[PDB]
């Protein structure tokens, strides 16, 4: 139904400029805010 990860779960992303950064899932949400 939902089944997600906790906000403190760390992920590794690549931003638009091509920047790799490790951030928490919730921080990613705030990044798209």
């Amino acid at each position: 139904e939902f089944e997600a990860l906790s906000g403190d779960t760390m992920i590794e992303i690549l931003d638009d400029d091509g920047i790799i950064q490790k951030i928490s899932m919730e921080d990613l949400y705030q990044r798209l805010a």
Binding site: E1, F2, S6, E12, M25
Partner: protein, 118 residues
């Protein structure tokens, strides 16, 4: 009785952000924020942990938290702790990651939820 409209904001990935997956850096459609009244707190011999829902799938084999028992190995990492903690928590997931739906979370391959697809 029950409603799942808590924090139904949802953020679209219109910033061209990608997440590192087994398939490489892949673009996800967006991220959802949900409220979960209980979750699993799993800790591995690797030292890393994961806090996710019950029927949240990890690897491509649709491996869900509730099917994992202490002593098993998840993607090469032995689960030493897997407690079902029944506390309301805010949870986040990525919708449709590239064309694989697998992505790295806490050094663990997780399976993304799908909002796109029929």
């Amino acid at each position: 009785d029950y409603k799942d409209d808590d924090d139904k904001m949802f953020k679209l990935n219109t910033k061209n952000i990608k997440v590192l997956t087994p398939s490489g850096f892949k673009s996800f459609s967006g991220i959802q924020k949900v409220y979960k009244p209980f979750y699993h707190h799993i800790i591995f011999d690797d030292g890393s942990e994961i806090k996710c829902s019950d029927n949240h799938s990890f690897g491509k084999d649709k491996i869900k938290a509730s099917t994992i028992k202490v002593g098993d190995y998840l993607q090469g990492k032995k689960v030493l702790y897997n407690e079902i903690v029944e506390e309301g928590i805010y949870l986040y997931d990525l919708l449709n990651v590239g064309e694989d739906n697998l992505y790295y979370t806490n050094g663990i391959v997780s399976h993304a939820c799908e909002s796109r697809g029929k």
